[PDB]
Amino acid sequence: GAAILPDLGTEILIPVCAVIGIAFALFQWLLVSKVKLSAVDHNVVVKCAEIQNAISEGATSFLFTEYKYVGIFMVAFAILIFLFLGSVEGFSTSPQACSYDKTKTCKPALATAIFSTVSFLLGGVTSLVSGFLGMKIATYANARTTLEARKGVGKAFITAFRSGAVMGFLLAANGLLVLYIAINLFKIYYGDDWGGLFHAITGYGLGGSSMALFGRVGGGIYTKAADVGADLVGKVERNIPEDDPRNPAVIADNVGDNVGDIAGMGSDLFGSYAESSCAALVVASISSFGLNHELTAMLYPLIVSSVGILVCLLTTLFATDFFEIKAVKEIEPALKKQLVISTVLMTIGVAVVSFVALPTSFTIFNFGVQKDVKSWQLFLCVAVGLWAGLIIGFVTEYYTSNAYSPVQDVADSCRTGAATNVIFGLALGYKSVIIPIFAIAISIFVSFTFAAMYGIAVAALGMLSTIATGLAIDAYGPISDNAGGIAEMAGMSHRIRERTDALDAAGNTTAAIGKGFAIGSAALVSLALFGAFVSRASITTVDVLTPKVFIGLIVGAMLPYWFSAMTMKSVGSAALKMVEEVRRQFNTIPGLMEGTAKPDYATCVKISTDASIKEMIPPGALVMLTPLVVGILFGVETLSGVLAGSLVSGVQIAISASNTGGAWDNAKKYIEAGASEHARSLGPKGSDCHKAAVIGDTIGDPLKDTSGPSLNILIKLMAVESLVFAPFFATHGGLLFKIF
Amino acid sequence: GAAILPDLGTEILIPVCAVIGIAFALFQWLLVSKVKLSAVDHNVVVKCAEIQNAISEGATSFLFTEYKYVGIFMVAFAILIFLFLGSVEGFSTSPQACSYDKTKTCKPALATAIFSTVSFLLGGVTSLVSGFLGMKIATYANARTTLEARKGVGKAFITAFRSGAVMGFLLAANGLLVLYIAINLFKIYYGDDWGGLFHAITGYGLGGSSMALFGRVGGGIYTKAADVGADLVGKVERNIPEDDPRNPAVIADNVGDNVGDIAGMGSDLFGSYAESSCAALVVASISSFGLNHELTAMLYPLIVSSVGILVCLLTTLFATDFFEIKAVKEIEPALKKQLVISTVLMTIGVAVVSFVALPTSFTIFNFGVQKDVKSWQLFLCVAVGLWAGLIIGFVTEYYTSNAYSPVQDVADSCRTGAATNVIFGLALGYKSVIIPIFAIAISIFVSFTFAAMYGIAVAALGMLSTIATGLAIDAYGPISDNAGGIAEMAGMSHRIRERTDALDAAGNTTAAIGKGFAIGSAALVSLALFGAFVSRASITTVDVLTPKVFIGLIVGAMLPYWFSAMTMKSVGSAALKMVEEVRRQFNTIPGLMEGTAKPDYATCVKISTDASIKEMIPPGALVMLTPLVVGILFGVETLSGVLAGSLVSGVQIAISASNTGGAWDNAKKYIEAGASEHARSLGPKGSDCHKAAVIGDTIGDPLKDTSGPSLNILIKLMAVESLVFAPFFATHGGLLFKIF
Ligand SMILES: [K+]
Ligand SMILES: [K+]
Ligand SMILES: [Mg+2]
Ligand SMILES: [Mg+2]
Ligand SMILES: [Mg+2]
Ligand SMILES: [Mg+2]
Ligand SMILES: [Mg+2]
Ligand SMILES: [Mg+2]
Ligand SMILES: [Mg+2]
Ligand SMILES: [Mg+2]
Ligand SMILES: [Mg+2]
Ligand SMILES: [Mg+2]
């Protein structure tokens, strides 16, 4: 029948939790504000503050530029959405039989065409705010982390983690709240037509991820162009420290961290959150929950997320208060414990939520038939995703942390030069896919078996139920990155850089981990969305052994490579420019190498601004146009193949790129830190071994920061896009087969 | 209906063409014998023949070693083939109703369990002979190519190309003759049970690809460990010319070209040919050709191959007689003319064959139903694969020859160091997959529609119809590669090496093209076998949106990466050892760097001998065990997913790795040749640009020569293997689902 938790209870619980998540984030921002500094040893607090201003000014500046374009694109694309969805019923205004129940009347397809546009814009905008907010907190916390490092690793860790949590909590609560608001607003018009309500609502994730795609690639190109240029000429050529203020590309590099690893990453994960929620909602909308108009159960995913916010708050308190770091070897397990604790607490949280928000029996729509599902089967659906996530974290840590043998061997291979470094690095990344894929496959199998597409979507959301914490441990990294950047630029003592280098190395692992969650959840949500698309397209069977499906499958499997070709080439080209620029300034500015002359930072900022803004367009277009072109020309069966193929194929390359990139970075950190006999025998900085690592790191740069992480967006974006345009491809698509 | 050409004529025609092909091969060998030399400036000729002997001894010594292990394994696996297939009908000896026509009676399954073992071993042995005969001609032709280079490139080119033709006509004609024999031999037992006959014949391809997986991987690891070692210490560290007899790894390296790029590749393409024929045969055996016992049409594939030889013979004359070569500008065009001419003639050829060897109307088995097909549609099926082959060749040249921009930009990117070289090279390879996939997709759509799994399989044969030429142009490369290594080692003039370097460069592009054909044809044949596998396993539908298929799909898609992880790491490790070794000799043996002392070659041969024999086992096991493990534990649905997944995923990485690898190679050559202002700008040899390219080149070594090309075996092997064991899996597999 109904659940223990009455509807009005749900309607209160959700926004209350969002409000708690927001209040908690503000509180943390407030605590961080205790670290004082101003640009008006005293000299060192003044240099930190000016550098921080430079970075802040650059990051805010680029985003406004980027968002202007993306914002325009968004508005264009929303028009396409209205037009195409609107034409499905020739823009009629009349009601129609509910496609999920012929006996009832549903709102016109036109309404949905309109509201899908509204949720799209909503998601687009929210995705922009997610990246902008993360950027504001990161550019605020970076120099404060630097100053706090004067007292030790532990203190700096706290200010970087707290701030990472500012972003995590803000993003989760705001994404939750907006969606919650959107649903309640849409419902006023839809009333009893919940299928229409929730089918319109899915624009929200389409919005989120479209904007994310450009945010990730734009930011991604911007940052790696600087990073490669700065590192190659500075470290490999001119034998100076990494973020040396003599290096004209350092400002661009550090801004790059906020603009890619933060803003782009933030948008990326918002889209993950939005899509997973949306995919669970559409399926439930025509399951027993939606048909019987049972609000609490319908909003199950949002209740899961609300509780995630609370669990993550708790988990946060452990790292922030109940515990203290005194030694560097403690940083990574601190971070790892955030995942362990949250996963355990959330397992209990989901149990409770599954107990009180689900009737013990219900039906889940399953390709035209109401499948009987029990609430303990559902618990296992979200729990299996949540646990697959954790497994993925552990495996990814094992492959990217310099505490373990894979990366150490990679560093060790530097002893025979760059070529062996790269071979080992590539080999490592390839190897690293094995277990996450099994974890994903297991997740699919359990969740698919128990509750079809709905179960799979709820597994995705389970993997993202602790998104607040996931984001915190991840956002922690770029802030720690800037901290050391600012330390070197501020001429602070070697003790500070060693501390930031410890934080930053842990950040590399944490980043690989976040990528892992992004890929894992993306594979889940995409499968669910694929299934939903299939019903909506009135496809009876996706048969791999039909010519239309199979050509789609193989072409779909190529797109991730097409996409990587473009993004790699962009970074490669922009970095080539950057290096020529950096060399020139060392070669022609008297006193630069000497330390008496100040370099031109703006020119480097300009090179990575010009390249990113321009070169984000073709890959964005590839992804976004593909479902349209394929659906219109070849049709829904073929598009089917493309969805499956880009899923199973993209996922392998996404994982191996992000991990290979991470492994190289930390293999270099291992050499730079020389905190063991092995490490030292590879040093010191400047050695042939070290420069070999730098070469690896630098090749890994676009792998793990531009193409790699955007691949998960490629996959999940094409999937909501397809679901949103499904009736339009069903009705007006497959032209090439119609004319012939 | 039946065909113009009588069964008796077909029985005569086939071996005549085979005999002709062998007659033409021996002839070319005799001409090569004209270039006389011996061991036991004429001081050169003695040194060359001394050098040639170290290599010939090395190649031979390794293959025997390698073939000892493979042969043993070949025996073990054959037992499994007998046990597992025997267990289908409890090892009964009674006849049984035909699988395809219940009204009729068919031979015992046990009989087939036996013949499948017979054809398998027949295949393994014919594979080993293919690689061995290729090594023998190559090891005989290399020094002959060196000596005739004293009279310009043109004369050195013919001895090289004639020798390439020797391997190509022996392989194409021997695989044909044995198959033909095996069929007729098998017929004696099977009589009217053609279904049983040609299902028994499929073991042939399973055998060929089985004894090729190990030869490609094993030989690919021997070479490349040597290659990376010799080049990194030689050129990058000690600044001596490539293949300098000072370098203790040069003998292994030049042996490696024969043991990997000749032997391994020879076996690879044998598998490709055997599988394509066998695949075409099995669908035909239960089509109207096999039901109505129409022999000529039944052996249509073997008839296509037969005219293939003749056509390729004619085509070869154009390079051997009808047209000569002066400018190095001409070599690449001469090689590419061989593709174009053979493709045109053979288009007419297949038209002839299709007009005389097929009834104008017939039926093709189509997933349980006889599908009406017209002989002109079959013409199109093989032609589309034939032309797809040419397209793939052209595109592969565009992305791998240093006469075009992609590779030139890659070389150019060396100006900013090894990292930009690697980033650019990686991007290029990714890029390069687009058009070939499209070609493959088009071939599939056209062939699948017309004639189902038969068309597709016949499209694979179409792409391989000119294999005699394909092998000629490809084998030519390693022969040229050795010819330059011997020149250096014999200390002939700069002008000698500069000529072979041009021949070698042509060989690089030519080896990439061979890789395209291998990958292109493998995608085609695997899909047909997959199809065949599906009927044979009594699967109604391969539905992507089922838990069993989907987990198969994503896991299958991971396999190519797991396999690449092993093979890359293998070369990485062996390469690390080889460098440590070449350095050891350079630092200890007094006056070695001078030339007053002889390096210990045997040590370097041992490091690579030890690595390859050991390290080829796991990846072989992975590919061999996967169907068995998946089919038995999870069942034929999941294995369906695995097969589809490993196909669409593995092809992307196979192409991109091969092209990247070829690209870095030719970019290095480009600099080394300095035949333009731009090339000379990056030089001279020893320069930073040249070293950065060497780094890129040695990273690409395992990419194009170990992992990359082996992947096409991974895909096609798993497909035949799955087909052969289908009844077993259908009957006794799926355990994990039965018990729970
Ligand atoms: K990081
Ligand atoms: K070659
Ligand atoms: Mg850097
Ligand atoms: Mg950074
Ligand atoms: Mg940094
Ligand atoms: Mg890092
Ligand atoms: Mg970096
Ligand atoms: Mg080499
Ligand atoms: Mg070689
Ligand atoms: Mg060579
Ligand atoms: Mg080569
Ligand atoms: Mg090589």
UniProtKB/Swiss-Prot annotation, chains A, B:
<feature type="transmembrane region" description="Helical">
    <location>
        <begin position="376"/>
        <end position="399"/>
    </location>
</feature>
<feature type="binding site">
    <location>
        <position position="231"/>
    </location>
    <ligand>
        <name>Mg(2+) 1</name>
    </ligand>
</feature>
<feature type="topological domain" description="Intravacuolar">
    <location>
        <begin position="357"/>
        <end position="375"/>
    </location>
</feature>
<feature type="topological domain" description="Intravacuolar">
    <location>
        <position position="635"/>
    </location>
</feature>
<feature type="transmembrane region" description="Helical">
    <location>
        <begin position="636"/>
        <end position="663"/>
    </location>
</feature>
<feature type="topological domain" description="Intravacuolar">
    <location>
        <begin position="447"/>
        <end position="452"/>
    </location>
</feature>
<feature type="site" description="Important for proton transport">
    <location>
        <position position="261"/>
    </location>
</feature>
<feature type="topological domain" description="Intravacuolar">
    <location>
        <begin position="191"/>
        <end position="193"/>
    </location>
</feature>
<feature type="binding site">
    <location>
        <position position="665"/>
    </location>
    <ligand>
        <name>Mg(2+) 4</name>
    </ligand>
</feature>
<feature type="site" description="Important for proton transport">
    <location>
        <position position="275"/>
    </location>
</feature>
<feature type="transmembrane region" description="Helical">
    <location>
        <begin position="329"/>
        <end position="356"/>
    </location>
</feature>
<feature type="transmembrane region" description="Helical">
    <location>
        <begin position="59"/>
        <end position="88"/>
    </location>
</feature>
<feature type="transmembrane region" description="Helical">
    <location>
        <begin position="453"/>
        <end position="479"/>
    </location>
</feature>
<feature type="transmembrane region" description="Helical">
    <location>
        <begin position="8"/>
        <end position="34"/>
    </location>
</feature>
<comment type="function">
    <text>Proton-translocating inorganic pyrophosphatase that contributes to the transtonoplast (from cytosol to vacuole lumen) H(+)-electrochemical potential difference. It establishes a proton gradient of similar and often greater magnitude than the H(+)-ATPase on the same membrane.</text>
</comment>
<feature type="transmembrane region" description="Helical">
    <location>
        <begin position="422"/>
        <end position="446"/>
    </location>
</feature>
<feature type="binding site">
    <location>
        <position position="508"/>
    </location>
    <ligand>
        <name>Mg(2+) 4</name>
    </ligand>
</feature>
<feature type="topological domain" description="Cytoplasmic">
    <location>
        <begin position="664"/>
        <end position="706"/>
    </location>
</feature>
<feature type="topological domain" description="Intravacuolar">
    <location>
        <begin position="733"/>
        <end position="739"/>
    </location>
</feature>
<feature type="binding site">
    <location>
        <position position="704"/>
    </location>
    <ligand>
        <name>substrate</name>
    </ligand>
</feature>
<comment type="similarity">
    <text>Belongs to the H(+)-translocating pyrophosphatase (TC 3.A.10) family. K(+)-stimulated subfamily.</text>
</comment>
<feature type="transmembrane region" description="Helical">
    <location>
        <begin position="606"/>
        <end position="634"/>
    </location>
</feature>
<feature type="transmembrane region" description="Helical">
    <location>
        <begin position="261"/>
        <end position="286"/>
    </location>
</feature>
<dbReference type="InterPro" id="IPR004131">
    <property type="entry name" value="PPase-energised_H-pump"/>
</dbReference>
<feature type="transmembrane region" description="Helical">
    <location>
        <begin position="707"/>
        <end position="732"/>
    </location>
</feature>
<keyword id="KW-0926">Vacuole</keyword>
<feature type="topological domain" description="Cytoplasmic">
    <location>
        <begin position="321"/>
        <end position="328"/>
    </location>
</feature>
<feature type="transmembrane region" description="Helical">
    <location>
        <begin position="161"/>
        <end position="190"/>
    </location>
</feature>
<keyword id="KW-1278">Translocase</keyword>
<dbReference type="GO" id="GO:0005774">
    <property type="term" value="C:vacuolar membrane"/>
</dbReference>
<feature type="binding site">
    <location>
        <position position="257"/>
    </location>
    <ligand>
        <name>Mg(2+) 3</name>
    </ligand>
</feature>
<keyword id="KW-1015">Disulfide bond</keyword>
<feature type="topological domain" description="Cytoplasmic">
    <location>
        <begin position="223"/>
        <end position="260"/>
    </location>
</feature>
<feature type="binding site">
    <location>
        <position position="224"/>
    </location>
    <ligand>
        <name>substrate</name>
    </ligand>
</feature>
<keyword id="KW-0812">Transmembrane</keyword>
<feature type="transmembrane region" description="Helical">
    <location>
        <begin position="194"/>
        <end position="222"/>
    </location>
</feature>
<feature type="site" description="Important for proton transport">
    <location>
        <position position="705"/>
    </location>
</feature>
<feature type="binding site">
    <location>
        <position position="227"/>
    </location>
    <ligand>
        <name>Mg(2+) 1</name>
    </ligand>
</feature>
<feature type="site" description="Important for proton transport">
    <location>
        <position position="216"/>
    </location>
</feature>
<feature type="binding site">
    <location>
        <position position="481"/>
    </location>
    <ligand>
        <name>Mg(2+) 3</name>
    </ligand>
</feature>
<feature type="site" description="Important for proton transport">
    <location>
        <position position="268"/>
    </location>
</feature>
<feature type="topological domain" description="Cytoplasmic">
    <location>
        <begin position="577"/>
        <end position="605"/>
    </location>
</feature>
